[PDB]
């Protein structure tokens, strides 16, 4: 008998990012919004940075400023709030020192300590209900070593 | 380095439905069927109804009667069994009183107590093996406040 | 109000495979690869074989030898390592005896004891970094009863 | 050359009615509630349960055996009251009724097993306008239920 | 002005063979089994395990040290027998053998660690045609294993 | 005809600072570390935590109250040292400082609650070139933290 399963993977051998539990991060995520609290439940996940060189510092920024755009109207865009490892993420690059990442402290050689990843969004005129419908965008992730 | 993640969300600010854990319900679900027990493992999930007005009663029905239709033969349809919060769901509307939902009892203002959601299906001539192959359909969800 | 959810399922009433928790196996899986350890985190999952006849032995092999093929270059293929229930899986068929599967030992009639399922992959010249980019393939699953 | 692993196996058997977890696991004997200095509140403990009965036609009455309190474990005069909740109805010494039909016995699983229902135990300071004194506390939630006839 | 949190750290170290959980966590010292009045049965406890050994070439013998029973904790005459299972083989006082090759040592993880195997502890009434008396019970599963030479 | 389920409710209340789990659950009083004969090492216990404070402008100092050890519970002379870690900084008797800004107080949740941080307790043999003697051990991790002014 035959059951079929697609296997895909995403290699990169200088530096990558996976969840603490070793599985790959997903390729997409659905955020929720609450009528009662008028806000969006965020998305938390734990990640360990892998690398071939732990000695390097690590700088972070979004390839471009993240938004959830109405899929039937471009003019409607509620901004996306990104946060990694206690630090807010934007175009304005943030630097992450190796010793501040706790490399020894975890894992087999190279792997870092778990860092929190949060993604969320808020209405631009926060507190006034957003317009109904579906929304979408891409949070893109830029991180290099050596500043 | 660049890793890409799609962010989508689904706003609605009068009333919505999310899982108890605050994440959004999925957009699709795979049910299983068992050869040995000749039945289908159901799908359970916990949800909290959000709203801008807790005072309203809540009526529920499927936009239309739910089925799993063979994807290579429309003539083959095993019916879909839906159940929310101890009450079976159909076209025949079911009413859910606010005080019976336990609003105060949970959460920040407005949010309700967790309610179970079950989806399943059975062979129409239950007990005689269904024909092999893939099947599909949409469970659509109708809930309004004020009867 | 209307929220939409797709329900799909995959019937087969002589023999099927589902996870121990009763949910269906996914249709696809993303493996991860680690820069630091230069390896791929595997994918473990627990399954119970269902059947209409527990008395039969069970033979296993992949419909064809499993690979992760660069999606922009066919010439790049890192091999896929498959393992089920303590036994490595390949084209070379492996036989699984019913009494060795522990049928009584579990579940309502017919269902077997949980068996581990591992999928992974390794560089073909293991220890030398693989080339970056995305990769893909299908692990296909062949299991019949009666050898 | 003797390698042995011991595991203690216990069970609270009741043949008429019992409240288990949604997953079929037994409820905890004990639960620990954290408290937040930042938000000045306790994090409620929540768990999905299902009544299992031998008579699914019967009503279900549930009540606490005594008003539950967090008690300073070095000073019995210090208390914060415990709040309990089940299937959306706040519990008390004053009983609450749950009709067999509002329990969802049809909609779920085997005979005599209910739909799932949220059990919540939290606590609070006496006047939210003030914080509790530091230290350890403890208390007992004593759940009491008859089905009827 | 002193805020301290204490955590007790324990460990059962065996250098030759030990059975851990699939996730690497240590097995429980204790397990609680719920019982269902509706279905008149106990919910088995199940957990994925992996033998870790220092010799993966050796056979693995496993057995209970004494036939396990649930015992009424107010009346020792009252018992329901405990059923134990591992890697699909029912356990007993009578040993069972598990060949190094049927354990899946190659297929998984580091040297000396097995594929995953289901450990099941449940129990039952003495004659399914009757229910147990209400009350609390308890018992001990005492797992015994040699590898060999 | 009396069916009652008792649940013990406890709580460690501190109004100035407390470390809870990321999910809001209270940390464990106790943790069990398995050890692997195959890999000759212990499986570290790991859990995501968040400081909750009443002053998110303050620094956070954290230290152990005494150097933690696994102690043979039949022979006090036998020890394996315990290693503790939090938010990527190895803990000790020698204090460690954590600036309010390196904690991620903005990036997460309600006022006064930090971003998540990994707490790790593991242990090791004294000279990795040798194994520990078999038996049970136990010890105490005693976490100590001031915020400051
Ligand atoms: Mg639960
Ligand atoms: Mg009360
Ligand atoms: Mg497990
Ligand atoms: Mg036995
Ligand atoms: Mg946690
Ligand atoms: Mg230390």
From Swiss-Prot, chains D, E, F:
The entry's keywords: Fimbrium, Plasmid, Signal
Pfam families in alphabetical order: Fimbrial_CS1 (PF04449)
Cross-referenced InterPro entries: Fimbrial_CS1-type
Induction, per UniProt: CFA/I fimbriae are only expressed in the presence of the positive regulator CfaD.
Superkingdom of source: Bacteria
Subunit architecture: CFA/I fimbriae are rather rigid, thread-like filaments of 0.5-1 micrometer, with an apparent axial hole, and a diameter of 7 nanometers. A single CFA/I fimbria consists of about 100 identical protein subunits.
Disulphide linkage map: none
Entry's family note: Belongs to the fimbrial CS1 protein family.
UniProt keyword annotation of Signal present: yes
Compartments it resides in: Fimbrium
Protein name: CFA/I fimbrial subunit B
Function, as annotated: Fimbriae (also called pili), polar filaments radiating from the surface of the bacterium to a length of 0.5-1.5 micrometers and numbering 100-300 per cell, enable bacteria to colonize the epithelium of specific host organs.
GO cellular component: pilus
């Amino acid at each position: 008998h035959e059951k079929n399963i697609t296997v895909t993977a995403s290699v990169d051998p200088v530096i990558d990012l996976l969840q603490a539990d070793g599985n790959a991060l997903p390729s997409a995520v659905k955020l929720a919004y609450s009528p009662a609290s008028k806000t969006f439940e965020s998305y938390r996940v734990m990640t360990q940075v892998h690398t071939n060189d732990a000695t390097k510092k690590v700088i972070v920024k979004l390839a471009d400023t993240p938004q959830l755009t109405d899929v039937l109207n471009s003019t409607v865009q509620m901004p996306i709030s990104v946060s990694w490892g206690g630090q807010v993420l934007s175009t304005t690059a943030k630097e992450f020192e190796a010793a501040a990442l706790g490399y020894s402290a975890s894992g087999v050689n190279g792997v870092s300590s778990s860092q929190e990843l949060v993604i969320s969004a808020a209405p631009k005129t926060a507190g006034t209900a957003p317009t109904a419908g579906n929304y979408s965008g891409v949070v893109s992730l830029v991180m290099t070593l050596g500043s």
